[PDB]
Amino acid sequence: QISVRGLAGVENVTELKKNFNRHLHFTLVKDRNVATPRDYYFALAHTVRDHLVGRWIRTQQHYYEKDPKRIYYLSLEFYMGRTLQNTMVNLALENACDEATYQLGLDMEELEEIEEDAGLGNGGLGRLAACFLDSMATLGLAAYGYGIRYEFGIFNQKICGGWQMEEADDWLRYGNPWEKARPEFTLPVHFYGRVEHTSQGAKWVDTQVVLAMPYDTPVPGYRNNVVNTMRLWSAKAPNDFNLGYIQAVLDRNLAENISRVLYPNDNFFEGKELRLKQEYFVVAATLQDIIRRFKSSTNFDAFPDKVAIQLNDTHPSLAIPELMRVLVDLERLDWDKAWEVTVKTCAYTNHTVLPEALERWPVHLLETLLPRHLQIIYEINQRFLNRVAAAFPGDVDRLRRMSLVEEGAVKRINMAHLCIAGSHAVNGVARIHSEILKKTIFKDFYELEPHKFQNKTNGITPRRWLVLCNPGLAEIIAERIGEEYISDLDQLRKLLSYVDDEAFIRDVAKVKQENKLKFAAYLEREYKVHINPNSLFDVQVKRIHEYKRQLLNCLHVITLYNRIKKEPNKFVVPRTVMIGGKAAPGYHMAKMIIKLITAIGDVVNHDPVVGDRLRVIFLENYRVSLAEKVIPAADLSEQISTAGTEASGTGNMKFMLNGALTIGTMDGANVEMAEEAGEENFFIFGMRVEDVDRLDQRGYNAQEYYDRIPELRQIIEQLSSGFFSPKQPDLFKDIVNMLMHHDRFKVFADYEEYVKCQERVSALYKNPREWTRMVIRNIATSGKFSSDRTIAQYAREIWGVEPSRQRLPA
Amino acid sequence: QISVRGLAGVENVTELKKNFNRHLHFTLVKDRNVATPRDYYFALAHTVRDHLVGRWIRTQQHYYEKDPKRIYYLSLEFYMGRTLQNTMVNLALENACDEATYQLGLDMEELEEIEEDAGLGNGGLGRLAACFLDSMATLGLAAYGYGIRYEFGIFNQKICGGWQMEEADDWLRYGNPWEKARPEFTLPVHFYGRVEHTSQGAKWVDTQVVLAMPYDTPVPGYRNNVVNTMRLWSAKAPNDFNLGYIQAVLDRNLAENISRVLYPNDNFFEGKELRLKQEYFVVAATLQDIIRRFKSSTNFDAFPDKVAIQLNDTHPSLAIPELMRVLVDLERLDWDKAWEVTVKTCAYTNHTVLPEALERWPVHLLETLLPRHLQIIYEINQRFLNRVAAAFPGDVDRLRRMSLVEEGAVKRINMAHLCIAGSHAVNGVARIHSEILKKTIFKDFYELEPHKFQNKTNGITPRRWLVLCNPGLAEIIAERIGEEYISDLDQLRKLLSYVDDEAFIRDVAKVKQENKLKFAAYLEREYKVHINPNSLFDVQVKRIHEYKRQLLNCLHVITLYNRIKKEPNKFVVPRTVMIGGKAAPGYHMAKMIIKLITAIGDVVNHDPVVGDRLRVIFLENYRVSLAEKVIPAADLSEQISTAGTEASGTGNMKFMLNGALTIGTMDGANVEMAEEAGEENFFIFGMRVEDVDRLDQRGYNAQEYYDRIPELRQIIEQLSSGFFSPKQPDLFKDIVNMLMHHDRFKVFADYEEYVKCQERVSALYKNPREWTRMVIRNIATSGKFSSDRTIAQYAREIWGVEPSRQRLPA
Ligand SMILES: O=c1[nH]cnc2c1ncn2[C@@H]1O[C@@H](COP(=O)(O)O)[C@@H](O)[C@H]1O
Ligand SMILES: O=c1[nH]cnc2c1ncn2[C@@H]1O[C@@H](COP(=O)(O)O)[C@@H](O)[C@H]1O
Numbered sequence A, B: 001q002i003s004v005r006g007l008a009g010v011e012n013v014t015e016l017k018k019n020f021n022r023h024l025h026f027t028l029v030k031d032r033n034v035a036t037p038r039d040y041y042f043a044l045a046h047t048v049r050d051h052l053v054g055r056w057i058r059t060q061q062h063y064y065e066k067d068p069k070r071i072y073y074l075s076l077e078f079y080m081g082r083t084l085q086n087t088m089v090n091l092a093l094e095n096a097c098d099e100a101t102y103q104l105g106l107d108m109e110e111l112e113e114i115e116e117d118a119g120l121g122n123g124g125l126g127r128l129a130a131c132f133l134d135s136m137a138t139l140g141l142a143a144y145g146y147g148i149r150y151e152f153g154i155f156n157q158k159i160c161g162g163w164q165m166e167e168a169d170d171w172l173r174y175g176n177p178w179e180k181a182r183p184e185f186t187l188p189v190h191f192y193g194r195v196e197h198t199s200q201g202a203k204w205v206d207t208q209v210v211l212a213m214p215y216d217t218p219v220p221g222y223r224n225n226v227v228n229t230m231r232l233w234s235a236k237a238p239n240d241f242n243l244g245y246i247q248a249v250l251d252r253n254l255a256e257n258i259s260r261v262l263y264p265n266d267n268f269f270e271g272k273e274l275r276l277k278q279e280y281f282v283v284a285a286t287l288q289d290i291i292r293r294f295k296s297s298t299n300f301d302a303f304p305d306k307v308a309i310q311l312n313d314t315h316p317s318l319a320i321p322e323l324m325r326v327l328v329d330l331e332r333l334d335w336d337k338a339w340e341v342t343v344k345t346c347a348y349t350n351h352t353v354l355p356e357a358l359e360r361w362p363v364h365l366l367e368t369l370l371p372r373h374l375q376i377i378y379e380i381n382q383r384f385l386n387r388v389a390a391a392f393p394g395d396v397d398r399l400r401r402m403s404l405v406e407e408g409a410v411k412r413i414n415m416a417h418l419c420i421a422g423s424h425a426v427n428g429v430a431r432i433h434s435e436i437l438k439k440t441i442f443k444d445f446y447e448l449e450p451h452k453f454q455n456k457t458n459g460i461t462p463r464r465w466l467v468l469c470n471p472g473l474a475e476i477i478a479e480r481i482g483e484e485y486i487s488d489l490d491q492l493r494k495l496l497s498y499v500d501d502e503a504f505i506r507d508v509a510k511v512k513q514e515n516k517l518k519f520a521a522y523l524e525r526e527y528k529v530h531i532n533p534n535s536l537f538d539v540q541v542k543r544i545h546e547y548k549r550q551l552l553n554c555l556h557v558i559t560l561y562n563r564i565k566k567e568p569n570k571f572v573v574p575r576t577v578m579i580g581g582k583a584a585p586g587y588h589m590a591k592m593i594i595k596l597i598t599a600i601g602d603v604v605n606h607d608p609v610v611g612d613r614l615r616v617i618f619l620e621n622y623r624v625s626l627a628e629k630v631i632p633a634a635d636l637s638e639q640i641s642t643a644g645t646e647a648s649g650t651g652n653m654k655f656m657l658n659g660a661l662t663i664g665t666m667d668g669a670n671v672e673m674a675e676e677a678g679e680e681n682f683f684i685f686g687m688r689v690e691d692v693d694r695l696d697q698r699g700y701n702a703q704e705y706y707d708r709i710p711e712l713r714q715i716i717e718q719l720s721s722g723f724f725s726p727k728q729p730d731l732f733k734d735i736v737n738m739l740m741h742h743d744r745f746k747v748f749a750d751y752e753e754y755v756k757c758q759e760r761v762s763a764l765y766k767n768p769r770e771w772t773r774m775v776i777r778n779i780a781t782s783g784k785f786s787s788d789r790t791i792a793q794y795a796r797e798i799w800g801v802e803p804s805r806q807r808l809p810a
């Protein structure tokens, strides 16, 4: 059908059909007469999986023979989404599978919709890990992702009476055809116990044992025949565990709970014992696997030449003391040699500066759960502080600030400080964020060891986020500049020579229009809701958080509503305002924001004077598969965090690649996006980081904005008096009180500039030709935001390995 | 190699090899260079499974089209053992698979040993269910086994310091290639709640819901291309279950515990709420499935013409009130019509008369868990007792005895009485047991409804228990009389014409000798123990229970030891005495018996004066796969329960088929075995049922036997004084005290006759020719004990269906 989806050769189509029928009969044990669409999805998934297998075996064989440096990417989260289509794209099988299924009387698009998301992350951090795995495979790196196979991923969100309800995401109910259990490589993980000191060093004894069973998932590179591995650990009780009899067997659940559920917090630290168990579980199993692989090739001097460990935030930070434990207690290396090896092996990526997101574990938890690790942490701290004292003699306050051990009512370990001490490289995830790290929270560490600190601006994979989700746009691009851009996204710059080409302008606008119609129909079918597809699609999708300022968007929506009601017979550019995202279950204010958004919709969408000039839709259950649908349909991307708070963002980049314009603050990667595209092709507004700092020094007083801006006062009076909640007039008083008296994110301070900037958006949308030309300028300069670029930088500047675009033999 | 294992044609061998390599590569994702023997086992299992699939689909299709009467066999236990070899035997693939694997450089016997037993039962009751499934498929019946897929089956037994230790049987750890999950046919099961009475009948409301997910396992018939289904239910929480957030997800375990573990009691009732949940779970899910299948063909008058439900003891007895609940509350049938349908549909098999084994559930448990069922039970009882009062007017004591509701400190429901009331047929499992039912515990019911009471003597499948475990014996039989006996075991009578044939005598003895050498080598390899394979192999394997009288065997072993020590230079026939079996974890006396057996071994096996004339071995972890090894090697089968206590026995029959002679009491099926073979060809001893009754009327006084039999007094003094436990002289005082003062099973009363009978065994063993002739007479008359005979009787006399030996097309 379309070129970028590959060839549908007669031999290949015939073979796919044979194998589909083979799997339906033998694997699924169904005949066509009772097969459901789910059976057909599974038969197709098994058919496509068979094509991965040979490449997977050959790739892993190739690494055993060549013995390259291995990259281990450790994360508590891998937000993978669906696998079927991505696998077909990466193996060039999409058109052949389409044809094969078409000839069997089936619609492949319908079958794709049956697959569950692998929702093993919360948002951006977990999705970054997934994009990175795709880029590492595409760049031929001998890379392994290591994590936890949660039985329950991020909860499914239902909206009932305008409120978020949570349901368990039982993603494994029907089976997962992509994984392979490897019960043969099961490893023990120790907890509790105590330390005894012999003449032959320390011994960690009387421990409870939980088994870590690995499940392997293939990670195909883009058309290079490389298939890497994502290894996820599941918790199993040993068979003598607790061994009246019946109760002992039922109590195996206590051990197996470690891998049961993903903690559903985004940018928030919850210091619970179960979470600490999860962190150690992943680290201890992974490190044993790493060392096993290293020994199958005494001399740990070469360990950093053969192994890189990348810590995805501090969540796997126990890798540092665990590596020391193994090297010192088990392999009998002297402390200094072990520390040298550890530092050269480990690197740390920071993803946030919000204080409530930083992991600070109570000493009493570590003392009970991991007594040997606590001793090792204390020794690291004493040796580290001795270096600080030698470099900055007499600076006693610096010793207190830099300590791994925080004093207070409860003594805590600062895991970020541990990661900096024990890593040869520390990076932020966008230029402004990496600068903030050096100037504020890690300033002291930067002064001691400036060479450690780097930037690696985030990216997204153009396979999933262009080719897979927006084939129409991929194709019209490919017609002009060929297919090479899919693995070399900088080639999109060539599109700048088509900015005045009438046919290209028309095609870009046509693809957007098609995507909007398709999404408007999706909404009607699955959610009984009717939207005008000629309206500007104004989209804010991301987790619900005060710092992301969904509330600022709400204030603009109410402003538009009030302006319409004031002058109903004036023309306004029609908008469909779509907001979606999950709130963490314990985050009360985030749950109230969801309720406000639905309550605004309840008023706006049923006011006959508004008509179809303004609609407000809350998009339920925002997740990777919904992102793939809504992002290609968007006109305007809302990226409106308070300057200094969004470390990078990656949704921002997805929208840029897919032909939306951006309204945003100079925060995270928005700064670099604006720089690449030109500030004239971006809708920038609001306080810069420096302006936020100036306000904080003077003191933020929200009342000043309320007193000076009549349109804002009207909105607050509407919220307070029960206009958006007639039956419960005080329902939103917590929101009003926060905005007026303890708003950490200065919503009112950016309100006037935001509304004015939104008026400029509407003015440009009225001139479709100029809107579309600006879009071309954004798509054309989005190349920097490929995760292939990001990963090549990690590879060269941190891991010390050279990427490769060369194909393994088929 | 041997004829009964089928053809190894070049085409078939080539195809099996191709498919083996296909599964190793694609299914297991291994290459030969890292494959372990476990990988090879799985590749073979998947290869053999592929041959079942077409037949399974066609069989189930055939039943949908023909719509025969369906037989539903409901059991809490299915003791299946291993599947690989049985599948090969039933599909005539054994020699081809042997050849295929041989050409790949692998030993198929070694691969078979890797498979885990499916240990989803305790002993005889669960194993009977498994034999029955094999016979139902072999006889072409449209039969379904329904049960629970326990995550943990019967515990693995380890012996430490002579004591039983229990370990969880994590049988699913490496996967089960035989099952197919069917998450699409998941059904809800209700618990707790309350009953409200509308004008439109009763409604069971406010219930907790647990989901029942089915897993299907194929059950191949013997060379007839029939493949029936065993459907096992697994418990799943619904996704809104308990829905802070983390705890709600972890608490899903409370619902899922229902299918977690098999209760490990044999012939003992433990009235725990979890067990009641298991019983209702299996019944409620199964009955919905039955009704669904019936409707896919208003008129419940035809229900008993299309459906038979066989209750395997009272464990699934809630089927009776559940069927009434569905018919009356949901389908709106009048009570009398529903009861007619229920009675005509259900039949009940009793497997024990021991009072501590009978299920008597406290009313307070049923009231809380199953309030509607309790109401229905009360209504059944009132209507039933009205019939009793009309038939036997004024007999008030009979009303009390026959009531379903037992009065007392705690009110209980007698589930056996419920089953009799609600079934059209009630059977025992051997002639003497069925007579005991009519004369003693069910006498009142027999007088009311004599037509209900039947006998169906138990049997064993000759596929598993001859062809599979003893190919050498199967072959030498087949050389004389052909292969037809494998599905028509009565043809073994033809062997009586070879009782004086010198070559047949030699071959029978040769096969036994080979089996003994093979078992003696197995013992050495796996358990570091050295036995004389020229000794008489004296074997007692079965669950440890006071009624089975392992203690009587112990008394004989000590008697032999003491006789040797008294006259060391006299010849005695050498014996290896082997005792094995599991004790229920809470059954203290059974655990003490195990310790006594090992303690006797500790003395006897290390006494240099004994030499290799007497060895006592405790066979660890007795289970189906160990039975398949030890039974073909046995010379003497110990079946020595107190008369009136072993309802049938089935181990007894396994030994008879495999060329052991039997020493036993006139109990259970031993009576019928002796009748078939001739009493002259059986070593019968001890009290008959009538003699036990006479002793009970006079009063059993164990002291009388102690005072009169010096050899017995010596043994008791050795036990009491610490001869078998020097470091803990009082270790066995509980055993001595029980034997002397509260022995319900009259061990001392059969001691003298048992020892004298054992002397006759030894005398015959000295004349190998006459021993072997007696063996031929036993094997030749074992035909009655085929489960094919048993199932044909159930089919004709209870279910109203005709068996068939006709083949479905291949
Ligand atoms: O002893 C060996 N001989 C040959 N290949 C090996 C051996 N050990 C590991 N491998 C290769 O590496 C394995 C990949 O798994 P890993 O050992 O977890 O990296 C297999 O797929 C083999 O291809
Ligand atoms: O609607 C139908 N059309 C054709 N065959 C059916 C239908 N429903 C059930 N079957 C057959 O019976 C099924 C066996 O599963 P069951 O329905 O659980 O007995 C399938 O394997 C089909 O062969």
Ligand SMILES: OC[C@H]1O[C@@H](c2nc(-c3ccc(O)cc3)n[nH]2)[C@H](O)[C@@H](O)[C@@H]1O
Pocket: A122, A124, A125, A128, A265, A266, A267, A268, A269, A351, A352, A357, A429, A458, A646, A647, A648, A649, A650, A668
């Ligand atoms: O760099 C990729 C993403 O990491 C996100 C981010 N997520 C988290 C986090 C997640 C879970 C948790 O328990 C604790 C913190 N920190 N930072 C950033 O907010 C986003 O700006 C960035 O693009």
Ligand SMILES: OC[C@H]1O[C@@H](c2nc(-c3ccc(O)cc3)n[nH]2)[C@H](O)[C@@H](O)[C@@H]1O
Pocket: B122, B124, B125, B128, B265, B266, B267, B268, B269, B351, B352, B357, B429, B458, B646, B647, B648, B649, B650, B668
């Ligand atoms: O008829 C086959 C077998 O059932 C055995 C038997 N097992 C049980 C039982 C099992 C588990 C349980 O929880 C409660 C009772 N009752 N009867 C008999 O003892 C045996 O003689 C018979 O051959």
Ligand SMILES: *Cc1c(COP(=O)(O)O)cnc(C)c1O
Pocket: A122, A123, A124, A127, A541, A542, A543, A622, A623, A624, A627, A648, A649, A650, A651, A652, A654
């Ligand atoms: C990309 C993505 C995110 C991150 O979006 P931000 O706007 O950068 O917070 C979150 N959730 C999902 C499902 C995503 O695909």
Ligand SMILES: *Cc1c(COP(=O)(O)O)cnc(C)c1O
Pocket: B122, B123, B124, B127, B541, B542, B543, B622, B623, B624, B627, B648, B649, B650, B651, B652, B654
């Ligand atoms: C046959 C069998 C039984 C029943 O044996 P009995 O001697 O009749 O109690 C118990 N366990 C296993 C493993 C069996 O194969």
